[PDB]
Amino acid sequence: GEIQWMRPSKEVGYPIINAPSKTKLEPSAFHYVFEGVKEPAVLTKNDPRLKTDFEEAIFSKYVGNKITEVDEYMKEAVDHYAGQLMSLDINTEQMCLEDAMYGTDGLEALDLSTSAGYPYVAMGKKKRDILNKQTRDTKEMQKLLDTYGINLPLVTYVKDELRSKTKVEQGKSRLIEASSLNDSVAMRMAFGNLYAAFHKNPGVITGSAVGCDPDLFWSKIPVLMEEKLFAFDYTGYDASLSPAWFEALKMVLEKIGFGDRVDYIDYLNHSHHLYKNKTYCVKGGMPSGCSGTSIFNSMINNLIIRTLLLKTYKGIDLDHLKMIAYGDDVIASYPHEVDASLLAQSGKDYGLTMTPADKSATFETVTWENVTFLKRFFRADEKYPFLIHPVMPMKEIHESIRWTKDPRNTQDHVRSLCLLAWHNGEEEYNKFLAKIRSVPIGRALDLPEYSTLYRRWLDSF
RNA sequence: CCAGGUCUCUCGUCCGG
Ligand SMILES: [Zn+2]
C-alpha cells in the first residue's frame, strides 16, 4: 500500500461524503457483571480519548513497496499452488449477471442491508432500490452498469467496532473501502465460479478455511495436518502486500483458467478512494471492501508461505505441505519441523512483518495445545478424543457481552455467545450462566444447558 | 428518519415443501 496523493475532491469533481460521526455501541446490561479492557474505536478527529493525531494514525498503514518482481521462488510457489487448484476442476466460465447478483450454489446474494457505494450513495440510492430477490430482476443493474461502468472510486469509512485501550489512544481505528455495487457485480460475474469452488472446498487443497464450520471442521483439521505444526502472525498484512504478490496471483489465475480477467486484479491495484472532503489514490494493495478479497488474500498466503519454505529450506518437498488459511490467518504443517523465526527471516526481504503466533514474546514450538486458528484453540473431547472442540477463550466472550448496538438484540446476542463458550467446558460454561443470571435481565433470557449443547454437538457429527 | 464495505459460519424470528 502506498498513497500517491490526496487533495480536496472539489477540485476533481467528486462529492463530499458525510460519514456518521457517532458510535452505535452502548454499554450492556452486563457491562459491570463482567470485566473487559475494550471500548468503541475512535470515529473522528475530535475525540477526547486521543493521544495522537487521528488521520495521521488511520493512514499510517500504507507503508510502501519492498518488491515488484516475481523472483524464481515465487514462480515455483505459483507453479505449485496452481497445480493443486487444478485438481478441483474449477468452472472457468463467466457467471451470468443473475447468479452474480442473486447467488447460485456456493455464492450468496449481494448483501441488501449494506451501502451500494459510489455514486449511488451520493444520489440517495440503495441496493434494495436496484435489486429484487424475489423476481431476480437484472434489467435495472444492467442499465446502471451500462451507464456508470466499472472501476469506480471506493468510499472510505471508519469501522464502528470494539477496540482495545492502546488502539483507542493511538488512533488505530480500522478503515473500510465501500466497494461499488457495479464493481461487486463485475467481480462476481468474472470470479463467481472461483469463489464458489473455494466455498465448497475448505481443506488443504484450496489451502483455505473460508466456508468451514469450526464446530465440525476442527475434528477434520488435525487429520489433515502433517506431523509438525508451525504458524506465525503478520503485522498489517494487506498494507504490506507488494505488487509482486499481485502478479504472482494473476499468474495462478492464468494457470487455472481465468487468464482473460486478470486485468480485474490490476484494477484492484490502482484505486481511488473518497474520504470525507478529500480524495486519495493508492497504488498497490487490494481494498478490503472489495469482492473476493477474502479468497484472494487466502490465495496469496498460500503463495507467500510456499515462497518462504523454498527459500529457507533447500529441497523441501512442497507436496508435504499442509496449510489452511483464512486471509492472513493460517495454520500450517510439514512432516519435519520448521522454524518460523527462520521463515519470518526471509519474509523480511519481501515486505512481510512476521511475528510469533499469538502475541508471544518469542517464536516457540507450535503445539496442539498452543496453536490457534480463527481465534480458537483445539482440545479433544474428554470422552470422544477424535472429536475436537474449537475453544474460544472466555476473555473474548466477556468483551463482547459488555456491549450492544441495540438492546432489542440481547437475547440473540447472548445466546450466540453461549454457542461459543460451552466448548470451554461444563464447569466454566455454568459459571458463565451464573453471572449472566446475576442480573434481572439475564433471568429473562432463555439460555441452553451444557448438556443440550453437548448432545447437539455429538449429534451434528 | 436514515446514514458505515467484502465474506464465511452459526443461531433466532418468521414462512414454506
Ligand atoms: Zn490514481
Tab-separated table of C-alpha atoms in Angstrom, chain A:
chain	number	residue	atom	x	y	z
A	1	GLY	CA	0.000	0.000	0.000
A	2	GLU	CA	1.145	3.493	-0.850
A	3	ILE	CA	-0.756	6.738	-1.096
A	4	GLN	CA	0.070	8.587	-4.319
A	5	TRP	CA	-1.775	11.780	-3.497
A	6	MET	CA	-4.574	13.495	-1.606
A	7	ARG	CA	-6.457	16.717	-2.411
A	8	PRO	CA	-9.854	18.333	-1.881
A	9	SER	CA	-12.169	16.309	-4.074
A	10	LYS	CA	-13.891	19.534	-5.119
A	11	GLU	CA	-11.056	20.259	-7.491
A	12	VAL	CA	-11.604	16.899	-9.178
A	13	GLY	CA	-15.410	16.829	-9.379
A	14	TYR	CA	-16.191	14.335	-6.613
A	15	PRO	CA	-18.890	14.602	-3.927
A	16	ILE	CA	-18.356	15.395	-0.276
A	17	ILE	CA	-19.412	12.355	1.770
A	18	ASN	CA	-20.746	12.524	5.312
A	19	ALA	CA	-19.550	9.627	7.414
A	20	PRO	CA	-21.645	9.167	10.529
A	21	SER	CA	-19.677	10.532	13.459
A	22	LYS	CA	-21.042	8.685	16.471
A	23	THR	CA	-20.564	5.127	17.696
A	24	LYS	CA	-23.552	2.828	17.896
A	25	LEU	CA	-22.071	0.704	20.685
A	26	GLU	CA	-23.628	1.362	24.102
A	27	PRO	CA	-22.906	-0.396	27.399
A	28	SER	CA	-24.819	-3.580	28.038
A	29	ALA	CA	-26.960	-4.890	30.850
A	30	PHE	CA	-23.826	-6.888	31.548
A	31	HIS	CA	-21.250	-4.078	31.483
A	32	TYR	CA	-20.451	-4.353	35.174
A	33	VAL	CA	-21.180	-8.042	35.618
A	34	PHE	CA	-18.114	-8.858	33.501
A	35	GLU	CA	-14.752	-7.175	33.247
A	36	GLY	CA	-13.093	-6.089	29.982
A	37	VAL	CA	-10.496	-3.678	28.617
A	38	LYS	CA	-12.107	-2.816	25.264
A	39	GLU	CA	-14.191	0.104	24.044
A	40	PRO	CA	-15.604	1.682	20.846
A	41	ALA	CA	-12.994	2.691	18.284
A	42	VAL	CA	-12.223	6.317	17.566
A	43	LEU	CA	-14.620	7.555	14.860
A	44	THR	CA	-13.474	11.213	14.453
A	45	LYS	CA	-10.546	13.631	14.724
A	46	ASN	CA	-12.080	15.480	17.671
A	47	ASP	CA	-12.116	12.615	20.187
A	48	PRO	CA	-11.136	13.379	23.832
A	49	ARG	CA	-9.585	9.895	24.276
A	50	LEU	CA	-6.971	10.553	21.565
A	51	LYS	CA	-3.262	10.628	22.444
A	52	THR	CA	-2.201	11.407	18.882
A	53	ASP	CA	-3.397	12.755	15.531
A	54	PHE	CA	-6.199	10.678	14.019
A	55	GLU	CA	-5.787	10.946	10.269
A	56	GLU	CA	-2.040	10.522	10.667
A	57	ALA	CA	-2.877	7.314	12.531
A	58	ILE	CA	-5.508	5.765	10.220
A	59	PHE	CA	-3.404	6.455	7.111
A	60	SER	CA	-0.190	5.198	8.675
A	61	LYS	CA	-0.669	1.631	7.357
A	62	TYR	CA	0.299	2.357	3.715
A	63	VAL	CA	3.982	1.514	4.314
A	64	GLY	CA	5.475	1.236	0.789
A	65	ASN	CA	6.594	-1.441	-1.674
A	66	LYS	CA	9.576	-3.704	-0.969
A	67	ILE	CA	9.405	-5.592	-4.266
A	68	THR	CA	7.603	-5.692	-7.621
A	69	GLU	CA	9.302	-8.515	-9.486
A	70	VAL	CA	8.304	-12.132	-9.244
A	71	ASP	CA	11.527	-13.992	-8.471
A	72	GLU	CA	12.009	-17.704	-9.011
A	73	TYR	CA	10.931	-18.875	-5.562
A	74	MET	CA	7.624	-17.032	-6.064
A	75	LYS	CA	7.491	-18.621	-9.545
A	76	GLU	CA	7.792	-22.149	-8.199
A	77	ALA	CA	5.288	-21.360	-5.457
A	78	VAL	CA	2.859	-20.125	-8.104
A	79	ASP	CA	3.504	-23.326	-10.068
A	80	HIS	CA	2.911	-25.494	-7.045
A	81	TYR	CA	-0.210	-23.768	-5.745
A	82	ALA	CA	-1.810	-23.553	-9.186
A	83	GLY	CA	-1.301	-27.284	-9.691
A	84	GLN	CA	-3.221	-28.082	-6.505
A	85	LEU	CA	-6.172	-25.912	-7.557
A	86	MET	CA	-6.164	-27.662	-10.937
A	87	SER	CA	-7.322	-30.781	-9.093
A	88	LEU	CA	-10.622	-29.120	-8.143
A	89	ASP	CA	-11.864	-28.811	-11.757
A	90	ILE	CA	-12.998	-25.244	-11.209
A	91	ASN	CA	-15.548	-23.963	-13.706
A	92	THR	CA	-13.672	-21.178	-15.541
A	93	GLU	CA	-16.714	-19.557	-17.162
A	94	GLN	CA	-18.103	-16.089	-16.594
A	95	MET	CA	-21.001	-16.177	-14.197
A	96	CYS	CA	-24.261	-14.730	-15.552
A	97	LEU	CA	-25.458	-11.415	-14.220
A	98	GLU	CA	-28.336	-13.150	-12.451
A	99	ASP	CA	-26.233	-15.572	-10.360
A	100	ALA	CA	-23.599	-12.919	-9.780
A	101	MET	CA	-26.300	-10.608	-8.404
A	102	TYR	CA	-28.566	-13.147	-6.694
A	103	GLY	CA	-26.472	-16.173	-5.860
A	104	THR	CA	-26.042	-19.733	-7.019
A	105	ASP	CA	-24.765	-22.891	-5.344
A	106	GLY	CA	-21.729	-21.759	-3.341
A	107	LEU	CA	-22.191	-17.990	-3.648
A	108	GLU	CA	-24.655	-15.951	-1.560
A	109	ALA	CA	-26.526	-12.954	-2.920
A	110	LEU	CA	-25.266	-9.445	-2.580
A	111	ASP	CA	-25.964	-8.093	0.916
A	112	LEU	CA	-29.091	-5.881	0.559
A	113	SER	CA	-28.519	-4.416	4.021
A	114	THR	CA	-25.350	-2.596	3.074
A	115	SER	CA	-24.484	0.523	1.050
A	116	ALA	CA	-24.277	0.487	-2.741
A	117	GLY	CA	-21.386	2.963	-2.605
A	118	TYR	CA	-20.262	5.478	-5.245
A	119	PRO	CA	-22.116	7.190	-6.858
A	120	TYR	CA	-25.333	5.574	-5.684
A	121	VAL	CA	-24.538	6.830	-2.227
A	122	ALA	CA	-24.313	10.465	-3.283
A	123	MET	CA	-27.608	10.018	-5.155
A	124	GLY	CA	-29.533	8.698	-2.137
A	125	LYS	CA	-29.944	5.411	-3.995
A	126	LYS	CA	-29.946	1.924	-2.366
A	127	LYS	CA	-29.283	-1.761	-3.179
A	128	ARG	CA	-32.890	-2.597	-2.278
A	129	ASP	CA	-33.910	0.009	-4.859
A	130	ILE	CA	-31.875	-1.740	-7.556
A	131	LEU	CA	-32.166	-5.425	-6.545
A	132	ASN	CA	-35.262	-7.596	-6.141
A	133	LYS	CA	-34.503	-11.035	-4.659
A	134	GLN	CA	-37.985	-12.375	-5.378
A	135	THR	CA	-38.112	-11.687	-9.110
A	136	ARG	CA	-34.345	-11.770	-9.545
A	137	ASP	CA	-34.640	-8.788	-11.868
A	138	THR	CA	-31.440	-7.908	-13.685
A	139	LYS	CA	-32.734	-5.172	-16.064
A	140	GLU	CA	-32.014	-2.325	-13.649
A	141	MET	CA	-28.472	-3.451	-12.721
A	142	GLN	CA	-27.515	-3.881	-16.337
A	143	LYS	CA	-28.631	-0.359	-17.128
A	144	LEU	CA	-26.586	1.017	-14.234
A	145	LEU	CA	-23.544	-0.947	-15.490
A	146	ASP	CA	-24.082	0.313	-18.996
A	147	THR	CA	-24.463	3.805	-17.547
A	148	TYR	CA	-21.682	4.070	-14.947
A	149	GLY	CA	-19.371	1.238	-15.930
A	150	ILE	CA	-16.830	-0.278	-13.572
A	151	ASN	CA	-13.609	0.695	-11.872
A	152	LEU	CA	-15.235	3.300	-9.649
A	153	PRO	CA	-13.748	5.024	-6.638
A	154	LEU	CA	-14.284	3.454	-3.230
A	155	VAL	CA	-15.725	5.281	-0.240
A	156	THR	CA	-13.644	5.319	2.898
A	157	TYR	CA	-15.314	4.801	6.275
A	158	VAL	CA	-14.002	4.179	9.784
A	159	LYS	CA	-15.345	0.986	11.259
A	160	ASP	CA	-17.548	1.213	14.355
A	161	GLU	CA	-16.307	-1.720	16.468
A	162	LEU	CA	-14.803	-2.527	19.848
A	163	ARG	CA	-11.090	-1.814	20.091
A	164	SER	CA	-8.585	-2.121	22.970
A	165	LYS	CA	-7.369	0.744	25.166
A	166	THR	CA	-3.987	1.374	23.477
A	167	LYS	CA	-5.521	1.326	19.966
A	168	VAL	CA	-8.018	3.917	21.090
A	169	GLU	CA	-5.323	6.293	22.337
A	170	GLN	CA	-3.102	5.545	19.312
A	171	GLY	CA	-5.979	6.164	16.913
A	172	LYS	CA	-5.539	2.702	15.375
A	173	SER	CA	-9.150	2.760	14.206
A	174	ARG	CA	-9.551	0.476	11.205
A	175	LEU	CA	-10.587	1.593	7.745
A	176	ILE	CA	-13.266	0.413	5.289
A	177	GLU	CA	-13.491	0.780	1.500
A	178	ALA	CA	-17.100	0.667	0.365
A	179	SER	CA	-16.833	-1.124	-2.934
A	180	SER	CA	-19.289	-0.046	-5.601
A	181	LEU	CA	-22.292	-2.134	-6.490
A	182	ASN	CA	-21.092	-2.029	-10.148
A	183	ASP	CA	-17.700	-3.433	-9.163
A	184	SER	CA	-19.100	-6.142	-6.854
A	185	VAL	CA	-21.292	-7.254	-9.712
A	186	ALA	CA	-18.480	-7.235	-12.294
A	187	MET	CA	-16.132	-9.012	-9.888
A	188	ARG	CA	-18.700	-11.763	-9.237
A	189	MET	CA	-19.509	-12.173	-12.920
A	190	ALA	CA	-15.816	-12.758	-13.570
A	191	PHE	CA	-14.842	-14.688	-10.488
A	192	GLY	CA	-18.055	-16.205	-9.182
A	193	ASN	CA	-17.191	-19.781	-10.115
A	194	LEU	CA	-13.857	-19.331	-8.367
A	195	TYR	CA	-15.473	-18.127	-5.101
A	196	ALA	CA	-17.970	-20.967	-5.337
A	197	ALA	CA	-15.232	-23.607	-5.737
A	198	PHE	CA	-13.422	-22.268	-2.716
A	199	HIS	CA	-16.558	-22.133	-0.561
A	200	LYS	CA	-17.426	-25.699	-1.370
A	201	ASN	CA	-13.913	-26.970	-0.626
A	202	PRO	CA	-12.462	-25.787	2.636
A	203	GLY	CA	-9.468	-28.007	3.362
A	204	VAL	CA	-5.828	-28.457	2.345
A	205	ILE	CA	-6.335	-28.477	-1.447
A	206	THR	CA	-7.590	-24.913	-1.675
A	207	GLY	CA	-5.462	-24.136	1.376
A	208	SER	CA	-8.376	-22.038	2.687
A	209	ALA	CA	-10.873	-22.214	5.603
A	210	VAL	CA	-13.497	-19.946	4.015
A	211	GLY	CA	-16.694	-21.991	4.012
A	212	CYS	CA	-15.926	-24.050	7.127
A	213	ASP	CA	-17.859	-24.533	10.349
A	214	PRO	CA	-15.407	-24.604	13.257
A	215	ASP	CA	-17.726	-26.787	15.410
A	216	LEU	CA	-17.192	-29.545	12.827
A	217	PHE	CA	-14.090	-28.652	10.843
A	218	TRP	CA	-11.951	-28.727	13.941
A	219	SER	CA	-12.302	-32.519	14.067
A	220	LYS	CA	-11.084	-32.676	10.427
A	221	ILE	CA	-8.054	-30.432	10.758
A	222	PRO	CA	-5.554	-32.457	12.812
A	223	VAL	CA	-6.027	-35.385	10.462
A	224	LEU	CA	-5.281	-33.112	7.556
A	225	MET	CA	-2.149	-31.645	9.058
A	226	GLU	CA	1.227	-33.339	8.708
A	227	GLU	CA	3.171	-34.400	11.764
A	228	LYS	CA	4.571	-30.990	12.719
A	229	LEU	CA	2.853	-27.598	13.070
A	230	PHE	CA	4.029	-24.096	12.528
A	231	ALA	CA	2.392	-20.713	12.403
A	232	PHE	CA	3.021	-17.007	12.907
A	233	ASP	CA	1.330	-13.604	12.809
A	234	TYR	CA	1.606	-10.837	10.257
A	235	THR	CA	1.514	-7.187	11.162
A	236	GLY	CA	-0.557	-5.242	8.653
A	237	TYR	CA	-0.977	-7.933	6.021
A	238	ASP	CA	-2.980	-6.114	3.352
A	239	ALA	CA	-0.933	-2.959	3.728
A	240	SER	CA	2.305	-4.872	3.345
A	241	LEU	CA	1.422	-6.754	0.151
A	242	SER	CA	3.711	-5.536	-2.620
A	243	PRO	CA	2.857	-5.641	-6.350
A	244	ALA	CA	4.878	-8.853	-6.773
A	245	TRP	CA	2.248	-10.758	-4.817
A	246	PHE	CA	-0.498	-9.467	-7.089
A	247	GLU	CA	1.421	-10.517	-10.183
A	248	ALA	CA	2.004	-13.947	-8.666
A	249	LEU	CA	-1.761	-14.140	-8.010
A	250	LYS	CA	-2.555	-13.201	-11.605
A	251	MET	CA	-0.164	-15.977	-12.701
A	252	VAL	CA	-2.123	-18.505	-10.604
A	253	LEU	CA	-5.292	-17.237	-12.197
A	254	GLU	CA	-3.867	-17.593	-15.746
A	255	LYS	CA	-2.704	-21.107	-14.745
A	256	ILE	CA	-6.149	-22.349	-13.646
A	257	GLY	CA	-8.071	-20.765	-16.489
A	258	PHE	CA	-9.049	-17.159	-15.653
A	259	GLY	CA	-6.457	-15.615	-17.971
A	260	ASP	CA	-8.894	-13.271	-19.671
A	261	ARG	CA	-9.908	-11.422	-16.468
A	262	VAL	CA	-6.642	-10.876	-14.555
A	263	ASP	CA	-6.991	-7.242	-15.604
A	264	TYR	CA	-9.547	-7.088	-12.792
A	265	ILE	CA	-6.610	-7.620	-10.458
A	266	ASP	CA	-4.709	-4.629	-11.821
A	267	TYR	CA	-7.818	-2.506	-11.342
A	268	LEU	CA	-7.817	-3.544	-7.690
A	269	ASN	CA	-4.165	-2.364	-7.500
A	270	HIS	CA	-4.758	1.189	-8.633
A	271	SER	CA	-7.687	2.606	-6.762
A	272	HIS	CA	-9.108	5.991	-5.877
A	273	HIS	CA	-10.799	6.465	-2.537
A	274	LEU	CA	-13.006	9.368	-1.412
A	275	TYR	CA	-12.736	10.025	2.326
A	276	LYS	CA	-14.828	12.848	3.772
A	277	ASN	CA	-13.882	16.059	1.951
A	278	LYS	CA	-10.895	14.720	0.023
A	279	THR	CA	-9.798	12.045	-2.457
A	280	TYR	CA	-6.727	9.837	-2.465
A	281	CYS	CA	-5.058	7.347	-4.752
A	282	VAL	CA	-3.365	4.217	-3.613
A	283	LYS	CA	-1.088	2.243	-5.892
A	284	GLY	CA	-0.543	-1.376	-4.941
A	285	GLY	CA	-2.640	-3.220	-2.391
A	286	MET	CA	-6.197	-4.545	-2.616
A	287	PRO	CA	-9.055	-2.693	-0.945
A	288	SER	CA	-10.637	-4.903	1.759
A	289	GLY	CA	-14.148	-3.723	0.927
A	290	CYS	CA	-13.797	-5.368	-2.480
A	291	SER	CA	-15.301	-8.606	-3.822
A	292	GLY	CA	-13.160	-11.695	-3.423
A	293	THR	CA	-10.670	-10.050	-1.071
A	294	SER	CA	-11.167	-12.798	1.444
A	295	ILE	CA	-10.416	-15.516	-1.095
A	296	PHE	CA	-7.597	-13.613	-2.849
A	297	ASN	CA	-5.839	-12.924	0.455
A	298	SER	CA	-6.051	-16.639	1.372
A	299	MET	CA	-4.614	-17.432	-2.043
A	300	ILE	CA	-1.743	-15.009	-1.508
A	301	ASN	CA	-0.947	-16.565	1.887
A	302	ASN	CA	-0.567	-19.911	0.162
A	303	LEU	CA	1.966	-18.407	-2.210
A	304	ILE	CA	3.733	-16.412	0.496
A	305	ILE	CA	4.254	-19.490	2.618
A	306	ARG	CA	5.375	-21.745	-0.267
A	307	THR	CA	7.778	-18.928	-1.255
A	308	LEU	CA	9.414	-18.785	2.174
A	309	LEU	CA	9.705	-22.525	2.641
A	310	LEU	CA	11.505	-22.901	-0.712
A	311	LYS	CA	13.840	-20.002	0.055
A	312	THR	CA	14.610	-21.139	3.625
A	313	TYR	CA	14.788	-24.920	3.285
A	314	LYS	CA	16.790	-26.408	0.441
A	315	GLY	CA	14.929	-29.280	-1.208
A	316	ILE	CA	11.802	-29.021	0.910
A	317	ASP	CA	9.032	-31.032	-0.776
A	318	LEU	CA	6.026	-28.750	-1.104
A	319	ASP	CA	3.960	-31.890	-1.723
A	320	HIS	CA	4.139	-32.500	2.025
A	321	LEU	CA	2.970	-29.016	2.838
A	322	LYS	CA	-0.439	-28.914	4.508
A	323	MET	CA	-1.857	-25.474	5.326
A	324	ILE	CA	-5.259	-23.863	5.676
A	325	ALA	CA	-5.524	-20.114	5.544
A	326	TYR	CA	-8.351	-17.693	6.255
A	327	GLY	CA	-6.936	-14.470	4.788
A	328	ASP	CA	-3.761	-13.753	6.716
A	329	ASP	CA	-4.705	-16.179	9.494
A	330	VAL	CA	-3.025	-19.519	8.813
A	331	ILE	CA	-2.299	-22.886	10.415
A	332	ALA	CA	0.417	-24.928	8.647
A	333	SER	CA	2.099	-28.314	8.853
A	334	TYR	CA	5.048	-30.312	7.438
A	335	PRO	CA	6.358	-33.836	8.197
A	336	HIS	CA	9.512	-32.442	9.812
A	337	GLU	CA	9.774	-29.333	11.951
A	338	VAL	CA	10.165	-25.816	10.541
A	339	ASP	CA	11.443	-22.739	12.341
A	340	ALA	CA	9.041	-19.819	11.911
A	341	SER	CA	11.717	-17.404	13.089
A	342	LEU	CA	13.715	-18.526	10.044
A	343	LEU	CA	10.576	-18.254	7.950
A	344	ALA	CA	9.987	-14.789	9.415
A	345	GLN	CA	13.601	-14.114	8.441
A	346	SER	CA	13.180	-14.363	4.662
A	347	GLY	CA	9.806	-12.644	4.964
A	348	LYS	CA	11.725	-9.524	5.918
A	349	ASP	CA	13.055	-9.467	2.363
A	350	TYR	CA	9.575	-9.439	0.811
A	351	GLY	CA	7.982	-6.646	2.874
A	352	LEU	CA	6.411	-9.170	5.268
A	353	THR	CA	6.335	-8.442	9.009
A	354	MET	CA	6.047	-11.881	10.662
A	355	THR	CA	5.781	-12.179	14.448
A	356	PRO	CA	5.420	-15.123	16.839
A	357	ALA	CA	1.914	-16.522	16.697
A	358	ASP	CA	-0.436	-15.417	19.472
A	359	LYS	CA	1.410	-12.285	20.572
A	360	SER	CA	4.125	-14.384	22.240
A	361	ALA	CA	7.412	-12.660	23.061
A	362	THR	CA	9.346	-15.415	21.341
A	363	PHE	CA	8.959	-17.838	18.481
A	364	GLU	CA	8.196	-21.109	20.190
A	365	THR	CA	7.405	-24.633	19.121
A	366	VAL	CA	3.816	-24.665	17.924
A	367	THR	CA	1.955	-27.467	19.614
A	368	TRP	CA	-1.575	-28.888	19.518
A	369	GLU	CA	-2.020	-27.285	22.950
A	370	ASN	CA	-0.944	-23.804	21.909
A	371	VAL	CA	-1.833	-23.409	18.209
A	372	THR	CA	-4.793	-21.178	17.415
A	373	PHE	CA	-6.780	-20.637	14.232
A	374	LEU	CA	-9.684	-18.199	13.810
A	375	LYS	CA	-9.041	-17.224	17.446
A	376	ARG	CA	-9.911	-20.689	18.800
A	377	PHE	CA	-7.940	-23.491	20.440
A	378	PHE	CA	-8.007	-27.234	19.739
A	379	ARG	CA	-8.978	-29.606	22.579
A	380	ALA	CA	-10.094	-33.203	22.279
A	381	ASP	CA	-13.343	-34.085	23.923
A	382	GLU	CA	-12.740	-35.991	27.151
A	383	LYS	CA	-14.989	-38.849	26.146
A	384	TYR	CA	-14.605	-38.910	22.356
A	385	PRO	CA	-10.951	-37.969	21.742
A	386	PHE	CA	-11.298	-37.908	17.921
A	387	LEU	CA	-13.833	-35.059	18.259
A	388	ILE	CA	-12.102	-31.719	18.755
A	389	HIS	CA	-13.694	-28.626	20.291
A	390	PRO	CA	-12.847	-25.226	18.841
A	391	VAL	CA	-12.156	-23.386	22.085
A	392	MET	CA	-12.599	-19.651	22.170
A	393	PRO	CA	-11.386	-18.134	25.407
A	394	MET	CA	-13.903	-16.526	27.792
A	395	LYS	CA	-11.914	-13.275	27.825
A	396	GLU	CA	-13.212	-12.535	24.332
A	397	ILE	CA	-16.768	-13.560	25.054
A	398	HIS	CA	-16.555	-11.275	28.098
A	399	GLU	CA	-15.506	-8.330	25.904
A	400	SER	CA	-18.425	-8.863	23.542
A	401	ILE	CA	-21.138	-9.192	26.124
A	402	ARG	CA	-20.487	-5.854	27.847
A	403	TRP	CA	-21.677	-4.024	24.744
A	404	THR	CA	-24.652	-3.788	22.378
A	405	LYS	CA	-25.729	-1.877	19.238
A	406	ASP	CA	-29.351	-2.198	20.245
A	407	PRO	CA	-30.663	-3.825	23.444
A	408	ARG	CA	-33.514	-5.312	21.418
A	409	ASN	CA	-30.805	-7.848	20.485
A	410	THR	CA	-29.739	-9.017	23.980
A	411	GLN	CA	-31.309	-12.466	23.686
A	412	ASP	CA	-29.958	-13.235	20.166
A	413	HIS	CA	-26.577	-11.781	21.091
A	414	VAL	CA	-26.042	-13.613	24.417
A	415	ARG	CA	-27.412	-16.878	23.102
A	416	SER	CA	-24.844	-16.685	20.280
A	417	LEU	CA	-22.023	-16.202	22.763
A	418	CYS	CA	-23.226	-19.376	24.565
A	419	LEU	CA	-22.632	-21.415	21.408
A	420	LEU	CA	-19.058	-20.185	21.576
A	421	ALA	CA	-18.468	-20.569	25.309
A	422	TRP	CA	-19.594	-24.082	26.232
A	423	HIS	CA	-16.542	-25.506	24.469
A	424	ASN	CA	-14.611	-24.128	27.447
A	425	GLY	CA	-16.348	-26.865	29.412
A	426	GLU	CA	-19.264	-27.535	31.754
A	427	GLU	CA	-17.688	-26.016	34.863
A	428	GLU	CA	-16.679	-22.831	33.004
A	429	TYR	CA	-19.933	-22.622	30.988
A	430	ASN	CA	-22.110	-22.910	34.124
A	431	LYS	CA	-20.088	-20.129	35.784
A	432	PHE	CA	-20.981	-18.044	32.701
A	433	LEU	CA	-24.675	-18.698	33.160
A	434	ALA	CA	-24.212	-17.761	36.828
A	435	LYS	CA	-23.032	-14.228	36.095
A	436	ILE	CA	-25.468	-13.655	33.203
A	437	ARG	CA	-28.175	-14.628	35.661
A	438	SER	CA	-26.664	-12.446	38.395
A	439	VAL	CA	-28.755	-9.612	36.952
A	440	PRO	CA	-32.533	-9.470	36.320
A	441	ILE	CA	-32.473	-9.097	32.505
A	442	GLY	CA	-30.297	-12.230	32.364
A	443	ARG	CA	-33.061	-14.218	34.067
A	444	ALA	CA	-35.341	-13.186	31.232
A	445	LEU	CA	-33.127	-14.907	28.741
A	446	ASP	CA	-33.636	-18.458	27.562
A	447	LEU	CA	-30.142	-19.953	27.617
A	448	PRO	CA	-29.265	-23.580	26.597
A	449	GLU	CA	-27.780	-26.001	29.122
A	450	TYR	CA	-24.332	-27.588	28.708
A	451	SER	CA	-25.910	-30.995	28.174
A	452	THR	CA	-28.205	-29.669	25.468
A	453	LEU	CA	-25.282	-28.024	23.698
A	454	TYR	CA	-23.196	-31.205	24.145
A	455	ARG	CA	-25.754	-33.578	22.703
A	456	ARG	CA	-26.326	-31.239	19.785
A	457	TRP	CA	-22.639	-31.256	19.112
A	458	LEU	CA	-22.233	-35.065	19.185
A	459	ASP	CA	-25.346	-35.373	17.070
A	460	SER	CA	-24.146	-32.902	14.475
A	461	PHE	CA	-21.398	-35.420	13.616
